[PDB]
Write a protein that binds this ligand. Structure first.
Ligand SMILES: CC(C)(COP(=O)(O)OP(=O)(O)OC[C@H]1O[C@@H](n2cnc3c(N)ncnc32)[C@H](O)[C@@H]1OP(=O)(O)O)[C@@H](O)C(=O)NCCC(=O)NCCS
Ligand SMILES: CC(C)(COP(=O)(O)OP(=O)(O)OC[C@H]1O[C@@H](n2cnc3c(N)ncnc32)[C@H](O)[C@@H]1OP(=O)(O)O)[C@@H](O)C(=O)NCCC(=O)NCCS
Ligand SMILES: CC(C)(COP(=O)(O)OP(=O)(O)OC[C@H]1O[C@@H](n2cnc3c(N)ncnc32)[C@H](O)[C@@H]1OP(=O)(O)O)[C@@H](O)C(=O)NCCC(=O)NCCS
Lengths: 300, 299, 300
């Protein structure tokens, strides 16, 4: 699968840097296609790939308005029930001929029966070229599968932000449920705002930390994305984003945590270089704890 | 000053009733065009009409997915610096031929120089047919100009806020936000507040007059917070407040961009307004607002 | 240069048939990229390809919500100042594996200097494999270049429709001007409505006639697209769409005709595929003239 979009002004901030989420949403659409295709290639029961996991990912070069984003997405492994997908995102400038690699990314998709909602299915095998690929896939397939068992300025409340979104039909999969990209894009929107509130300047997504997608969200759910700062290095900003879901339609289905992530953001020079960041000053018990966990995550 | 949109599923809730804000945004785009055209018809300095006021407005019939919304927008009056615009919004069903009037609406626009930001200009005269039109315009032009001088079923249970970074397609050809973009975001919030409370399908029944105090620039992050005030047996008042932070400037401080009361209705699976769970104020300010809300609801 | 993307409910009518315009816009974005790239490949003065012409084009199979549209776009010829581009559009259903060809299409782009607005430039030569390609290109490059030196139900007023659009920044190429796709999409939106009003049923774009793009439209222009029926065969509907532009700003300039086209539309069964169409009954002089010109065009 492959990639064409020319980045419009709506894909980017006022200073013309494309939003991290904008790229995240494209990556996912690519992944979602290649994987739903292949999960129906052996012609079992009809399914749809749903985004389950995304690996850490760093934004190498900025992308700008007018550049074409190229998105190539290959399947790298399968397990019994999961599909690994790696994705490369490259920015072509078509005036100067220049190219840069913006982004590598790895994703984990899982087929859900279209007939039986919530029924996981089996992922057909893929044909490799060497064993080392399958092993490297299995080691990475283990490494993820293990980790899954495990108001004052410059203060966290000053920049704290939340956003609320009613899930519409084009947010959703052909079935009632939301895309991974729709979610990831809304998360960046929030973290982005948190970051900007704090820095009081231009900002861009430098990196995103592994995400896991716990549960589905249905059409008509109103989802709330709340985001708050955790850590600051001299030149960066960690931001915890939490995503909750209320089904308003049902009295007997109670709110739940759909997903959560840490987003790192960068300030930028009017000239186009990362600048030093105003330092976050925790105050409560939990604030320093999270600031410390945030130094910890930031190292690894 | 005429139309055709056909209402897609993204224009409407899961039950297929078009969003109030979806209509509000179409009404405004119409008003914004006709008025910016006419404010450049005598060929003075180059300007852009900016939405200053919207009159009370009630949603008469529902509009549904697949129906064509027709939006006709006529200029009804001018003052020295303002433009009255009336807008009719009519829903055609194109399977059954049926038509309904969804909405009349009146809007007040004001030309701002494109060269000189913040410089109000003069609105050319329009040609009427009778004097009674101009008088009725002047009386209405005065009438506005005078008026301008967590427990379930509790307000905190349904309280909701939304935060939006103003992008380029939100804005006018200049740094500033459309009236329709704002009105649509307000309905998004009030809509959610309403739904949280009712726990059912809901639609915008009416919107009170709104006044647009100040501009909002590209790059401003705006926060729209909405909370219930009053409940009649079958309706829901919802106060929506819209604040603006320019994040870029340290020394330009937050401000209140606009505020409004939105009234919302629950609907029977069968398609009829039904009784609403009653809001129970608790604080001083909650009963005050509940009472002001009975007061507004009468008039 | 090619890609595809998954068709959301926003890409399609209530009955889930993708809009003709939706496809037209994708075709153009593809064409616009490949051609602006190549017009800067020999590294002259910096330019942007602008859509000048689109050939007749017919919609072979319908496309539905959930299907992936694949758009491949190759350069087929160049002249001194113009670029031919052919585009294939194929619909993959990713539940059933099925594929169909939806659409072939040919487009003519022309580089305009980014520094000097309105300054046409020269198109680098392309490397062919056989001469017959270049000749077939030249014959088609001539064939176009020649042709360019030339309220009662079921009545035209009943279905007549117009739409008015303020040109925003994301409608535009980086420079002040509108995309060909933006225009083509708005034209279909209107013709689509005209068709639906008349049939009183589901409808889809069956075909579109060659379009020529006379003049540019700038950011901030308000454009009016008016559409009205001309002819009806037993099973089809011709619809004339006219596109006017007012520069409301710097209004020493008067409104101008940006472009015009005839769009043919088809009614469809719930089962799907074409039904007989209520017959249009002209009434004025000009209505029968256009009804007759419409029989004439419909033959050839
Ligand atoms: C993915 C999902 C269906 C798993 O369902 P479940 O009832 O927990 O079933 P399990 O956890 O046993 O999942 C079975 C497979 O899921 C995989 N899986 C579950 N969570 C995962 C994660 N976070 N990352 C990668 N794989 C995951 C397991 O690796 C397992 O595969 P294997 O058997 O081949 O090793 C569930 O997490 C879900 O509903 N996710 C939401 C999907 C979605 O809506 N995406 C967008 C949301 S914003
Ligand atoms: C409309 C606006 C320009 C008025 O500016 P101001 O500094 O109040 O200027 P003035 O008081 O001299 O008003 C001049 C005219 O504006 C009209 N006006 C101002 N506020 C108004 C309101 N709320 N409703 C109707 N008319 C209004 C006056 O009636 C007056 O016209 P007149 O002289 O013919 O009676 C200003 O309030 C503004 O910029 N508003 C925001 C516009 C905008 O950005 N809208 C979109 C945001 S969502
Ligand atoms: C295309 C355009 C630049 C032509 O300007 P012009 O003043 O006619 O310039 P010229 O006639 O010298 O054009 C030279 C080349 O243009 C090409 N051209 C112009 N109009 C064309 C048409 N309608 N179809 C095909 N080719 C066309 C010719 O093929 C010619 O190439 P050649 O010299 O190699 O044979 C002008 O019509 C324009 O700017 N149109 C709008 C472009 C645009 O904005 N498209 C989207 C609109 S919604």
């Amino acid at each position: 699968v492959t990639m064409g979009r020319i980045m419009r002004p709506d894909d980017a901030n006022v200073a013309g840097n494309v939003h991290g989420g904008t790229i995240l949403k494209m990556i996912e659409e690519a992944g979602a296609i290649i994987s739903t295709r292949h999960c129906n290639s052996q012609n079992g029961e009809r399914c749809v790939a749903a985004l389950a996991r995304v690996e850490r990912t760093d934004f190498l070069s900025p992308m700008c308005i007018g550049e074409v984003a190229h998105v190539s997405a290959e399947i790298t492994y399968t397990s019994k029930h999961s599909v690994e997908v790696q994705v490369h995102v490259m920015s072509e400038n078509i005036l100067t001929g220049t190219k840069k690699l913006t982004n590598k990314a790895t994703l984990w998709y899982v087929p859900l029966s279209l007939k039986n909602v919530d029924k996981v299915l089996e992922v057909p095998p893929i044909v490799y070229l060497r064993q080392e690929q399958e092993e490297e896939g299995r080691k990475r397939y283990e490494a993820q599968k293990l980790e899954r068992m495990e108001p004052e300025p410059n203060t966290v409340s000053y920049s704290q932000s939340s956003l609320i979104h009613l899930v519409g039909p084009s947010d959703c999969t052909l079935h009632g449920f939301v895309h991974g990209g729709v979610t990831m894009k809304l998360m960046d929107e929030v973290a982005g705002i948190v970051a900007a509130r704090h820095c009081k300047t231009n900002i861009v997504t430098a990196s995103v930390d592994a995400i896991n997608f716990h549960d589905k969200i249905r059409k008509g759910c109103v989802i709330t994305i709340s985001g708050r700062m955790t850590f600051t290095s001299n030149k960066s900003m960690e931001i915890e984003v939490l995503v909750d879901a209320d089904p308003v339609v049902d009295n007997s289905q109670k709110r739940y945590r759909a997903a959560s992530a840490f987003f790192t953001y960068v300030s930028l020079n009017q000239e186009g270089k990362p600048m030093p960041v105003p330092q976050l000053v925790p105050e409560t018990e939990d604030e320093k704890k999270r600031f410390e966990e945030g130094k910890g995550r930031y190292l690894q």
